[PDB]
Amino acid sequence: EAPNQALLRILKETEFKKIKVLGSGAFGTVYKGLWIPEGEKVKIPVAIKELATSPKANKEILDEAYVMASVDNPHVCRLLGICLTSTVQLIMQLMPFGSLLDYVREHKDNIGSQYLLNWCVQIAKGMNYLEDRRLVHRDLAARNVLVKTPQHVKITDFGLAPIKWMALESILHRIYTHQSDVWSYGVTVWELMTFGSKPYDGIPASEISSILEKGERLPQPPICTIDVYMIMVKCWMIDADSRPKFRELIIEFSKMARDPQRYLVIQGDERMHLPSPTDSNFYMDDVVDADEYL
Numbered sequence: 001e002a003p004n005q006a007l008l009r010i011l012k013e014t015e016f017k018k019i020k021v022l023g024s025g026a027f028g029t030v031y032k033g034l035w036i037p038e039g040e041k042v043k044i045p046v047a048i049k050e051l052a053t054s055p056k057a058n059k060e061i062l063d064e065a066y067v068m069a070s071v072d073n074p075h076v077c078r079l080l081g082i083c084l085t086s087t088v089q090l091i092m093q094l095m096p097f098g099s100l101l102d103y104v105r106e107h108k109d110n111i112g113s114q115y116l117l118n119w120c121v122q123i124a125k126g127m128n129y130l131e132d133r134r135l136v137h138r139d140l141a142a143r144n145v146l147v148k149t150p151q152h153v154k155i156t157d158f159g160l161a162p163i164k165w166m167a168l169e170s171i172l173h174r175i176y177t178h179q180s181d182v183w184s185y186g187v188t189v190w191e192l193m194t195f196g197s198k199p200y201d202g203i204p205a206s207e208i209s210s211i212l213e214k215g216e217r218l219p220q221p222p223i224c225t226i227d228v229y230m231i232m233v234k235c236w237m238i239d240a241d242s243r244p245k246f247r248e249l250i251i252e253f254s255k256m257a258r259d260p261q262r263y264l265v266i267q268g269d270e271r272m273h274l275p276s277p278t279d280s281n282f283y284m285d286d287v288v289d290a291d292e293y294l
């Protein structure tokens, strides 16, 4: 396999300021922040993950840093660098609007078919990239998609060692493949097309495995034409080579994205508007997004 020449950037903790905490797990804490490379006159919005030391955890966060440093694609999250303090810190571009799953629940009343279909395209491009790079996600789901702007999303939490999102060969044989990812993409779309609902609500985790051999799948969401639902259902076929290739999903969803209301029927579609930072506001003055800093 080819030599992996990702650059790993070490940042100084004095070069950034934690501002608000975005979440707190037992393992660690993720902060909203700014990063100021000194003498470059830029303020990069970032997210800062910090663990407070466990030998095993220190190793895993560096595995994460290893993967996140290796990808570069507009619909995949990447690492800006790490900071070697008492406890290591991973430094990521900030995704201001959080996770897609939260974003479609809270902004449900204003999410029209154009956004829903573009998200599907963008998530498919993400996974097709992870396919080109022969990297299988193994944990794709609406919560692991982050929204930079409502018009731009990126996959996170990918490639690191949730049955309801798992292809069947992943459940019975613990097989994980790109076509296993195609299945979880399917559930992911279903999450968006239902505006955040929970898949297989109220079921035993165990039953799911024979439910799928029996042949049951998830329901058709109301807004979903047969054209969209069919594409999902093809992600849940059992023979993994009949399931679609992300590169096809890109095409098919991108086709539908040209005539959105022919493929998703949403009451009051054309009335809806979502914050576009170009459109409404970009609301400490001098700041560049990490994507324009490379």
Ligand SMILES: CCC(=O)N[C@H]1CC[C@@H](N2C(=O)N(c3ccccc3Cl)Cc3cnc(Nc4ccc(N5CCN(C)CC5)c(C)c4)nc32)CC1
Pocket (backbone or CB within 6 Å): 022, 023, 024, 025, 028, 030, 047, 048, 049, 064, 090, 091, 092, 093, 094, 095, 096, 097, 098, 099, 102, 146, 156, 157
């Ligand atoms: C796991 C413990 C945990 O709680 N994780 C969650 C919180 C951190 C979050 N997160 C990362 O983990 N990143 C990352 C991934 C890998 C390595 C390093 C890193 Cl830095 C990069 C990241 C970038 N941008 C955001 N934007 C963003 C997030 C949340 C919120 N709101 C605040 C108000 N609400 C109550 C709900 C949340 C908002 C408004 C904006 N969140 C990120 C992922 C999920």
Ligand SMILES: [Cl-]
Pocket (backbone or CB within 6 Å): 162, 163, 164, 165
């Ligand atoms: Cl689950």
